[PDB]
Design a protein around this ligand. Sequence first.
Ligand SMILES: CCCCCCCCCCCCCCCCCC(=O)OC[C@H](COP(=O)([O-])OCC(O)COP(=O)([O-])OC[C@@H](COC(=O)CCCCCCCCCCCCCCCCC)OC(=O)CCCCCCCCCCCCCCCCC)OC(=O)CCCCCCCCCCCCCCCCC
Ligand SMILES: CCCCCCCCCCCCCCCCCC(=O)OC[C@H](COP(=O)([O-])OCC(O)COP(=O)([O-])OC[C@@H](COC(=O)CCCCCCCCCCCCCCCCC)OC(=O)CCCCCCCCCCCCCCCCC)OC(=O)CCCCCCCCCCCCCCCCC
Lengths: 54, 74
Amino acid sequence: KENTGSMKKPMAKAYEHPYNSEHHPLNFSAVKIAETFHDFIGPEQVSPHYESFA
Amino acid sequence: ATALYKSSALAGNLFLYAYNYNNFTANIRLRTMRYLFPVVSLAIFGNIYWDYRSQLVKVNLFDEYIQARAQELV
Ligand SMILES: CCCCCCCCCCCCCCCCCC(=O)OC[C@H](COP(=O)([O-])OCC(O)COP(=O)([O-])OC[C@@H](COC(=O)CCCCCCCCCCCCCCCCC)OC(=O)CCCCCCCCCCCCCCCCC)OC(=O)CCCCCCCCCCCCCCCCC
Ligand SMILES: CCCCCCCCCCCCCCCCCC(=O)OC[C@H](COP(=O)([O-])OCC(O)COP(=O)([O-])OC[C@@H](COC(=O)CCCCCCCCCCCCCCCCC)OC(=O)CCCCCCCCCCCCCCCCC)OC(=O)CCCCCCCCCCCCCCCCC
């Protein structure tokens, strides 16, 4: 009997806010500023060498 | 040069508003900027054009006088 089960059709989509995006988030937090900051200073500059440059 | 720079800096503010249009428009914490940004923008445009317009009038007054006064002295 369990194998005979079926699945209902779900909704196509929920509400899409016309003024919120992943790159331009509507509301503010220090989390998004952190993403923009580490994109500016770039990722950790990993050295492949055995001694420091200086 | 001064009028062109101050016009480019004003255009820079318009980009800043366009780049952040969704926030200035939908977030109510920025409503005062949405409401008064154009008032400040017009007051800035007015100063830019006022100075250019006044300078333009004076230059034309200066040019028309030296021509007239010169012919009298001839
Ligand atoms: C026409 C001809 C003219 C042009 C000719 C061309 C010449 C162009 C010159 C370019 C030279 C090549 C550039 C190479 C990279 C930059 C230089 C460098 O050393 O980088 C490696 C050096 C470390 O080398 P590393 O081995 O790769 O790092 C390993 C570890 O990760 C590091 O951390 P660690 O702790 O894990 O490991 C040990 C660490 C231990 O030591 C340290 O970590 C140092 C601690 C410093 C941080 C402490 C907090 C202070 C910083 C706060 C930030 C303030 C500035 C920003 C805020 C204002 C915004 C601007 O490093 C050391 O071993 C000792 C430090 C190196 C020796 C001392 C050098 C002192 C001067 C360097 C800073 C410049 C100061 C300003 C001077 C300029 C005056 C206008 O990087 C730095 O520490 C900072 C670099 C910033 C330098 C900016 C200035 C560039 C101009 C360079 C000219 C030479 C200096 C002239 C100053 C003379 C004063 C005595
Ligand atoms: C060491 C040498 C020194 C050289 C000095 C020069 C240094 C470089 C300067 C760089 C900064 C200037 C940027 C110049 C363009 C460079 C191309 C570029 O953006 O990089 C590649 C850039 C991609 O960036 P990416 O680095 O590859 O990756 C970015 C990530 O994906 C992430 O995506 P994202 O979209 O989020 O990234 C945005 C990205 C790129 O953002 C952009 O979309 C670039 C557009 C920036 C426009 C600058 C304002 C100009 C306003 C329009 C004036 C039009 C006049 C003629 C009108 C004729 C029609 C009547 O970054 C910026 O927004 C740069 C903005 C720079 C700061 C501007 C602050 C202004 C206030 C301070 C004023 C100071 C006085 C000077 C102001 C001078 C103003 C003339 O390419 C594009 O974005 C393609 C855009 C395609 C559609 C554009 C449609 C037109 C948009 C026009 C906006 C209209 C605003 C409202 C109307 C205003 C007029 C009344």
